[PDB]
Write a protein that binds this ligand. Structure first.
Ligand SMILES: Nc1nc2c(ncn2[C@@H]2O[C@H](COP(=O)(O)OP(=O)(O)OP(=O)(O)O)[C@@H](O)[C@H]2O)c(=O)[nH]1
Ligand SMILES: [Mg+2]
Lengths: 563, 383, 145, 165, 579
């Protein structure tokens, strides 16, 4: 019933009662769905009232509705400008936070003086908010001279008569270091550093973390400052959780530059970290997932902290599907000559579940672990036995996948039970599963008197299969022939044929081509190329770039750390 | 470094929110749910969904999906930590967080948002610390947390040694994870700016996390725990006792399958404590097949029941003395066990409140009450 | 043409539901929630037509209430949406810009009018006048007996 | 109460005037843009003051205030002969509007301190005020830097607007 | 009941709503046992409401039908209502309905006959649309407007569940189109519509009534609405629509009826308001009829310019079908649709998802020869900020275009490369072979390709299909990459170390996939024959990954390794060649 302009009408009445109530109906039906950008004029007009809730309220509306209407947005301008020149500290600040919450290209020039005289304030709260809107603006459309002039203020803000001011100043200045005026990092000098500590100790929950998620970008000139500071950081069995504790270690773990084997402060440190870490194994569910991967990081650079702490890393039957596997992961990252015993007991009950990716990754570890040590590989043999014997297709498949890598670490050793892994090759409908069996059948065709039919049984159609399975089928048959020419001259032809004449896949056509560029000369240099030695892997279990490892820790608190 | 903050209700539609930075906003938040449901089938229920270079930090509360968003490298850690702390703030202003809860508090909520954080960076906040929404001062000052110069009818404090039993007994009855976590919920009804010291043991414990008001740069350097106590409900500290953790309540069980018309069960129930202690209101969880043919339940001590579909049996008794053994059986026809309880004992981790100092400017009375109890937490056994 | 029509508010309080095709109450509630959830799954910032199981659906959010229906792929989509603004006129001028109270308490008359306009899957009367006075006299023969 | 919309060339005195009247003091300002609100009473008639920025780029925005405007006041800088033409224009593009077809006008050629500032007769002429049929208006010599002529206009605005008591 | 629903209105939990309904559903039974004639109209409604909510409804399939027979109007109405809500198609209450229907189909009053025909079309299963089949044509004739409309529809409801009995209603066809009551007229259209469900009846209403319908669709328009005023804003749209629809099914495949309508068509279209949806609604059905019927070139054209005008319409909705139906004719009236392409591509810039897709999908297949140019630039702009779900498709779609049409190679390549530059990760897999074949065929831009490829890949690892491609080339074309005399655009610095350094961190940096690292391995090694001095660095790196985490990479590594260490020169020969 056109019930839109009806409200609009009263939204602009004479007195302030009917109007005020209207303002309530505004934001009310504003956040419920209906877009009331058509009321923008009559709303910002009431903004300049003397009410209280309504005051900040219209302000709320303005931030959210200014975007679509920059033109009429100019309505507020002077309001906020003088609003920051109000009495009670509460307003000036709120006035600013609301002010900068708008990005209208021109609001900039009008905030020139505001924020300027805003920084200057006997009350910290105002300064606090100020610094925020400063960085808040520099994030775009902000360069200028009086713009880089406020920068000078946020920097010196370091030594402020309060913790809040310095807290935000820290977080602010840090966020300003995002934009690159080349002079990134800024200054960081002994004076500013130590002075920050005083404003760091008695700052605030999040406030302190700000200086933590920031000071991370700095390395002491020597061990003096390093130890002196790191020491004042150790007491991080903190409250704020995550942010604080994390950042602490985070920034600290990185400070591993002090004279390597000093009087083990470096060690007592690596130790004084583990305890608070295992505690995150009880914080909010999502948090664990954070720490988890984080663990796979720090521990990868320095594992002598989560040494035998493997215990607590045991997944609870109820734990979320992600934290579950994730925990197992790291658990397979520090599995050594000792823990092996229980690591299996762990997995033994982890693969008996029904959680898809759980059981899958589970066994995926059963393999990798056997590769980690000897004692494992042995019992591991039995594990994979009964396991495939569960007759269940998928598990059987994933299991064979691990079997692949197993021989990669122990070739010419456990090939005595292969005849059994073939009994369930009929349940391999996945690229990796199929590929695996093809590699094993090829890689060790010298003993596989069945390699002929099988290997080529799958090739009912050259392509129309994962490029990977092709890349493997290729090298598989190449060895199938090299050891049995008297019955493969026809296969070699049609295998190489389609693999070199109509091969869409470049590398398939590359392997095929380069391959032929062998038998096309001397199968004498074939054995010296195709069947040569093949070095193991050794405790690979997801090993990341050693360099990428040193810098990934250079920022753990962030989400981009879990990688 | 957050940039977006959203509040959602089951359906996943924008319940309420405020954008603190510069992100597309409008979209993404809408495609959130669609990606959620799907990212569950894959099993990869990642706490952070991805869509067009937009991260999703979410926390699940009663009938509500709270979410955060930001393309900029966000310190996820603080994210969820804050999101939860936010719940703390609101979960105290109005009974509980619910679609209906927000349904009314719309107005104020916005207000709290503006004072919850700014441009992503969370401006310090907490339920009581937000009551004044004095506000210009109380906060602007260093001592914002919970101190100004008050006084109440009666001045008394209460120390509560809450401890949870961390049990994990593998298939063949062996504990790989033996411990008893816990905290100390401090009830405060004092006046002015009271400073209270406190000790314990230093058997004692392993790691320890305290509460905000603790002078960390004074504890780790003196083992002492001097702090400026925030009036209200706050946890002084969390701890961990995985060492010298003596075994706890026992229980023996065995299956029994005969044909497809009779599956039995023999579960006992022993317990380890101190001569005088008496366990109470205990309940054990023993599930039946994923279905249920003919229900049969026998009792020997107390009472027992079970629940269909949910697939499980719940056996609960009045109490249990300090050193007993109770059995129970049941049949049937055609997920380990995790008990739960409550015991008002002390040596749940060999904990004992050394003392409570009492120093302040005004007169000191000191009426320190202390409690000793401990419930379940994590128990499991059914090979 | 139309296969069925249901009116559910933001929540789940179905104000009225009349089907125009044979089907057991089973698939009825099946087609209910299935579409329901999906219905509200979209704000008013999107199209008003969605193909659900061979049949096209239409919807218009009247206040805190929804008016939807299914149509055969070979039919008039827009006109259908218009029929909504039609049927609603039936209820409206009968209760006076009716809201929810009348819908729940008088889903009966709502039906009497509805059916006294739609029958056998199609419209029986077009002109608004040959409707507002069509049911008014039909519902006026039950009030005096 | 009578809603009175303030208008006139930028840098005329509008703002300064308001606060000088509403409070009795000459404050230090700048080109207003968020129309400072104030409602000064004057004999059982509380007028709502609407001092909006007179800056060129933001003048077209003056339309969003036309709503329920009963009394108009066109304060101009008498000594700013350069924009006198611009004043005339703006004033007309304002009188043309229907939402103000009834509102009375009070032109205040402020800044009568400057000896060169065009006097009453001049402003009225330079604006063609005399050639305005079917229109309620008036012009009084004003100078915010003292208060002269201010309350005077009120007497006009007040009485004129109130067709009774 | 009206006082009972007021009780369940006190409940707040789904646990009490079950208690409030289970309490009444059980209390109503003790009032259904004795079969008390009174309250039989009350508790039946109390059950109907508990039925809609989804609760036990089989409780009153007895104390309800006992009112379907009652004399008093109150019981027949409150009963017939509950009959259409609480009843399945059982042959039990079917015979206790079939009879009462036939009994009230000829009652004294006429509104009792209203609930009759009404219930007949809401409960009539199979044994119903064949039982009272005689009570339909007998009442279809009786001139009693109110009944004639309700009956006409039942007649249709008889042809729905029983498509065999539409022959018994012929004795009322031809005249229908000359009624005075809007409803009947409409029901007369739907009745005639359901009549053409057989061939024999088609040619019957084919040659005949067609021209007569032209005057009807004309009367409704050209005026005939002012002297009416009984509609929202247009002359009985429903009627007009039903007209168009029937006009449609008639002139389906013919020339007589078709060419004998096109006139009134051109009028309707060009003479209808574009203001709001209503008018458009009229045109929607019209244009549809315009295509499903043979017509002159001019006419068909109009139908197009019409929909094209729909597009630019202020409100969304309309725009949706405007594009949906658009594709259906693109392959028919191709040349004509081009009249609005420019506006069509801009459509993509719309907020709604469905719009973007359909508009895009269609617009895509419309990129003609002399079209690629302009539409290409936009393709890029668009593709860049396209919603996630779209980017992936956009790529493949954009590539398809460059194939089905393309001028200069520099451009064709520069563009294909371009799209990879932004998308890449969103591109499928066959991309590598596809593009590679291009670069090779065009023996000029070889350098320019490897050159730009390099530069891009330098700081770009985030991309697999792309990097794989660029990499492959660099390996087989490392030569030209060496500050050669690259025509077209000036070459740059290319120290052998650089080329390698990049590749190194490639397979090394945890980002490249197995297949990804694959290209590199082979590619890198081949450089041994395509470079000057860093030949040593190669050998080393190669023998290193001879035992990495990857099986195939390690596999190959060893192979390539076993070559270097021993039969060096063999490479030079078995490499330089590229089929
Ligand atoms: N000398 C003198 N200066 C004046 C007089 N009236 C106003 N001003 C000055 O003119 C400047 C602008 O005054 P405002 O009251 O803000 O002018 P306005 O008419 O509202 O125009 P805008 O600022 O553009 O909105 C200030 O610097 C005043 O001090 C006056 O009578 N004499
Ligand atoms: Mg001014």
């Amino acid at each position: 019933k056109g019930e839109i302009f009806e409200l609009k009408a009263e939204l602009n009445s004479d007195k302030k009662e009917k109007k005020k109530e209207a303002v309530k109906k505004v934001i009310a039906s504003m956040t419920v769905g209906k877009d009331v950008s058509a009321l923008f004029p009559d709303v910002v007009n009431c903004m300049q009232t003397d009410n209280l809730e309504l005051k900040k309220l219209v302000y709320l509306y303005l931030m959210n509705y200014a975007k679509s209407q920059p033109d009429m947005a100019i309505m507020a301008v002077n309001t906020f400008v003088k609003d920051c020149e109000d009495p009670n500290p509460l307003i000036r600040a709120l006035a600013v936070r609301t002010m900068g919450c708008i990005r209208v290209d021109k609001i900039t020039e009008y905030l020139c003086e505001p924020l300027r005289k805003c920084l200057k304030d006997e009350d910290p709260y105002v300064r606090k908010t100020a610094a925020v809107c400063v960085a808040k603006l520099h994030d775009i459309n902000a360069q200028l001279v009086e713009d880089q002039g406020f920068l000078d203020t946020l920097k010196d803000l370091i030594s402020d008569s309060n913790p809040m001011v310095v807290a935000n100043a820290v977080a602010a200045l840090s966020e300003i270091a995002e934009s690159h005026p080349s002079s990134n990092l800024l200054d960081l000098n002994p004076q500013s550093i130590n002075k920050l500590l005083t404003a760091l100790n008695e700052c605030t929950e999040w406030g302190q973390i700000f200086i933590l998620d920031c000071l991370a970008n700095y390395m002491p000139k020597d061990d003096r400052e390093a130890q002196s500071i790191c020491e004042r950081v150790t007491p991080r069995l903190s409250h704020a959780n995550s942010a604080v504790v994390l950042s602490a270690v985070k920034v600290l773990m990185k400070f591993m530059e002090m004279l390597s084997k000093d009087l083990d402060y470096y060690g007592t440190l690596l130790k004084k970290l583990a305890p608070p870490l295992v505690t995150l194994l009880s914080a909010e569910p999502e948090l664990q997932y954070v720490a988890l991967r984080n663990i796979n990081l720090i521990v990868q650079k320095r594992p002598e902290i989560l040494k035998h702490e493997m215990k607590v890393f045991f997944v609870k039957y109820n734990d979320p599907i992600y934290v579950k596997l994730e925990k197992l992961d790291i658990m397979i990252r520090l599995a050594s000559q000792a823990n092996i015993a229980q690591v299996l007991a762990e997995l033994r009950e982890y693969a008996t579940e029904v959680d898809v990716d759980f059981v899958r990754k589970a066994v995926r570890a059963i393999g990798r672990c056997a590769i980690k040590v000897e004692q494992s590989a042995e019992r591991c043999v039995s594990t994979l036995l009964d396991l495939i014997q569960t007759k269940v297709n998928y598990v059987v498949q994933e299991a064979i996948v691990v079997i692949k890598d197993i021989f990669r670490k122990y070739p010419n050793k456990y090939e005595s039970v292969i005849a059994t892994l073939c009994e369930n090759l009929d349940s391999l409908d996945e690229p990796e599963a199929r590929a695996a069996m093809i590699w094993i059948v090829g890689e060790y065709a010298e003993r596989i008197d069945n390699a002929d039919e099988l290997l080529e049984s799958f090739l009912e159609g050259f392509h129309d299969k994962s490029t990977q399975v092709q890349l493997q089928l290729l090298t598989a048959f190449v060895k199938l022939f090299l050891k049995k020419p008297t019955e493969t001259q026809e296969l070699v032809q049609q295998v190489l044929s389609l693999a070199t004449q109509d091969s869409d896949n470049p590398d398939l056509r590359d392997r095929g081509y380069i391959y032929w560029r062998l038998l096309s000369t001397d199968p004498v240099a074939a054995k010296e190329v195709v069947l040569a030695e093949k070095p193991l892997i050794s405790e690979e279990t997801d090993l990341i770039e050693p360099t990428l490892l040193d810098e990934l820790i250079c920022y753990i608190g962030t989400l981009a750390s879990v990688y | 470094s957050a940039s977006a903050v959203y509040v959602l209700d089951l359906k996943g539609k924008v319940l309420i929110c405020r954008n603190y930075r510069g992100d597309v906003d409008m979209s993404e938040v809408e495609h959130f749910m669609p990606i959620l449901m799907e990212k569950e089938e894959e099993g990869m229920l990642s706490p952070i969904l991805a869509h067009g270079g937009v991260r999703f930090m979410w926390i699940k509360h009663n009938n509500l999906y709270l979410v955060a968003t930001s393309k900029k490298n966000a310190c996820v850690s603080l994210v969820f930590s804050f999101l939860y702390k936010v719940v703390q703030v609101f979960s105290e202003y109005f009974k509980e967080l619910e679609e209906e809860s927000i349904r009314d508090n719309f107005v104020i909520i916005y207000e709290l948002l503006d004072e919850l954080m700014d441009f992503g960076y969370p401006q310090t906040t907490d339920s009581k610390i937000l009551q004044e929404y004095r506000p210009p001062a109380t906060v602007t000052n260093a001592v914002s947390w919970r101190s100004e110069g008050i006084k109440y009818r009666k001045n008394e404090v209460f120390l509560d040694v809450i401890e949870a039993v961390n049990l994990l007994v593998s298939a063949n009855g062996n504990v790989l994870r033996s411990e008893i976590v816990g905290s100390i919920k401090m009830r405060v009804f004092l006046s002015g700016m009271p400073e209270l010291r406190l000790g314990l043991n230093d058997v004692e414990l392993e790691d320890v996390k305290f509460h905000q008001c603790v002078r960390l740069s004074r504890f780790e350097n003196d083992r002492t725990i001097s702090f400026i106590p925030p009036d209200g409900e706050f946890e002084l500290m969390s701890y961990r006792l995985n060492t010298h953790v003596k075994p706890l309540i026992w229980i023996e069980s065995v299956i029994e399958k005969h044909s497809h018309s009779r599956i039995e069960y023999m579960v006992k129930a022993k317990s380890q404590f101190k001569r005088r202690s008496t366990a109470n209101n205990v309940e054990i969880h023993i599930p039946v097949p994923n279905d249920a043919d003919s229900p049969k339940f026998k009792t020997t001590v107390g009472s027992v029941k079970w629940v269909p579909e949910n697939s499980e049996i719940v056996w609960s008794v009045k109490s249990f003395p300090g050193g007993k053994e109770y059995l129970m059986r049941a049949h049937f026809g055609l997920p380990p066990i995790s008990v739960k309880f409550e015991i008002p004992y002390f040596t749940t981790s060999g904990i004992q409140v050394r003392y409570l100092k009492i120093i302040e400017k005004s007169g000191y009375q000191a009426l320190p009450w202390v409690r000793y109890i401990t419930q379940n937490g994590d128990y499991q056994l059914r090979t | 043409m139309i296969h069925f029509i249901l009116l559910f508010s933001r929540q789940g309080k179905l104000r009225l539901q009349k089907w125009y095709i044979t089907l057991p109450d089973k698939e009825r509630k099946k087609i209910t929630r299935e579409i329901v959830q999906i219905i509200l799954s979209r704000g008013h910032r999107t199209s008003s037509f969605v193909d659900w199981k061979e049949l096209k659906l239409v919807y218009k959010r009247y206040a805190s209430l929804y008016f939807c229906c299914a149509i055969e792929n070979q039919d008039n989509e827009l006109l259908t949406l218009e029929i909504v603004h039609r049927y609603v006129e039936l209820l409206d001028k009968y209760f006076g810009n009716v809201c929810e109270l009348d819908i729940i308490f008088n889903f009966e008359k709502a039906y009497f009018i509805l059916d006294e306009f739609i029958i056998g899957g199609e419209i029986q009367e077009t002109s608004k006048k040959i409707a507002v006075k069509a049911i008014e006299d039909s519902d006026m023969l039950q009030e005096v007996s | 109460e009578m809603r009175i919309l303030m208008v006139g060339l930028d840098a005329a005195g509008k703002t300064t005037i308001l606060y000088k009247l509403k409070l009795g003091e000459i404050v230090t300002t700048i080109p207003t843009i968020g129309f400072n609100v104030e409602t000064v009473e004057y004999k059982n008639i509380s007028f709502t003051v609407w001092d909006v920025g007179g800056l060129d780029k933001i003048r077209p925005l003056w339309r969003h205030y036309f709503q329920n405007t009963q009394g108009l006041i066109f304060v101009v800088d008498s000594n700013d002969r350069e924009r006198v033409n611009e004043a005339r224009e703006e004033l007309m593009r304002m009188l043309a509007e229907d939402e103000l077809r009834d509102a009375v006008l009070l032109v205040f050629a402020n800044k009568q301190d400057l000896p060169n500032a065009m006097n009453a007769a001049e402003i009225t002429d330079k604006l063609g005020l005399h050639s305005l049929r079917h229109r309620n208006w008036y012009i009084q010599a004003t100078c915010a830097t003292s208060g002269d002529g201010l309350y005077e206009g009120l007497d006009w605005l007040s009485n004129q607007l109130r067709n009774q008591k | 009941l009206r006082e009972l629903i007021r009780t369940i209105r006190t409940a707040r939990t789904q646990a009490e709503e079950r208690e409030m309904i289970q309490k009444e559903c059980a209390a109503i039974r003790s009032s259904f046992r004795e079969e008390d004639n009174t309250y039989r109209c009350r508790n039946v409604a109390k059950l109907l409401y508990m039925h809609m909510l989804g609760y036990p409804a089989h409780f009153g399939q007895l104390e309800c039908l006992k009112l379907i027979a009652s004399q008093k109007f109150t019981d027949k109405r409150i009963g017939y209502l509950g009959a259409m809500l609480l009843l399945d198609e059982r042959q039990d209450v079917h015979l206790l309905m079939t009879n009462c229907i036939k009994n009230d189909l000829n009652h004294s009053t006429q509104f009792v006959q209203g609930l009759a025909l009404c219930t007949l079309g809401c409960m009539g299963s199979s044994e119903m649309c064949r039982d009272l089949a005689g009570e339909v044509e007998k009442l279809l004739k009786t001139s009693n407007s109110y009944l004639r409309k309700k009956a006409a529809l039942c007649a249709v409801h008889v042809i729905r569940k029983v498509p065999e009995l539409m022959e018994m209603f012929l004795p009322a066809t031809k005249n229908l189109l000359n009624e005075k009551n809007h409803g009947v007229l409409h029901t007369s259209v739907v009745l005639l519509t359901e009549m053409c469900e057989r061939s024999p009846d088609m040619l019957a209403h084919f040659r005949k009534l067609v021209p007569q319908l032209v005057r009807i669709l004309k009367n409704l328009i050209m005026s005939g609405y002012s002297p009416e005023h009984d509609v929202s804003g247009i002359s009985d749209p429903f009627l007009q629509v039903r007209i168009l629809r029937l006009l449609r099914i008639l002139g389906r495949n013919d020339d007589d009826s078709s060419e004998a309508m096109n006139d009134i068509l051109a009028q309707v279209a060009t003479n209808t308001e574009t203001s709001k949806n209503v008018g458009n609604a009229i045109l929607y059905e019209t244009v549809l009829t315009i295509m499903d019927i043979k017509s002159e070139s001019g006419l068909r054209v109009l139908a197009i310019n019409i929909l094209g005008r729909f597009l630019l319409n202020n409100d969304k909705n309309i725009r949706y079908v405007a594009l949906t139906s658009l594709l259906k004719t693109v392959q028919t009236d191709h040349n004509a649709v081009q009249r609005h392409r420019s506006t069509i591509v801009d459509c993509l810039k719309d907020l709604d998802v469905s719009i973007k897709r359909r508009a895009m999908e269609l617009s895509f297949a419309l990129v003609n020869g002399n079209n690629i140019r302009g539409m290409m630039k936009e393709l890029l702009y668009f593709l860049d900020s396209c919603e996630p779900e779209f980017k992936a498709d956009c790529a493949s779609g954009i590539f398809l275009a460059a194939e089905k049409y393309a001028p200069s190679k520099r451009w064709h390549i520069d563009t294909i490369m371009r799209v990879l530059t932004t998308a890449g990760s969103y591109v499928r897999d066959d991309a590598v072979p596809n593009l590679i074949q291009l670069i090779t065929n065009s023996v000029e831009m070889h350098a320019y390709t490897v050159q730009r490829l390099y530069k891009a890949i330098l700081g770009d690892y985030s991309q697999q299909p792309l990097v794989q491609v660029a990499a492959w080339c660099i390996g087989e074309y490392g030569d030209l990459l060496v500050s050669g005399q690259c025509e077209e655009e000036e070459p740059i610095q290319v120290t052998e170390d650089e080329v390698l350094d990049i590749l190194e961190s490639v397979l090394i940096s945890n980002m490249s996939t197995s297949v990804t690292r694959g290209y590199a391995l082979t590619a890198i090694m081949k450089l041994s024959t395509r470079f000057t001095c860093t030949v040593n660095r190669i050998k080393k790196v190669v023998s290193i990954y001879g035992s990495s985490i990857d099986v195939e990479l390690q596999q190959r590594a060893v192979e390539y390794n076993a070559l270097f260490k021993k039969y060096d020169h063999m490479r030079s020969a078995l490499l330089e060649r590229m089929p």
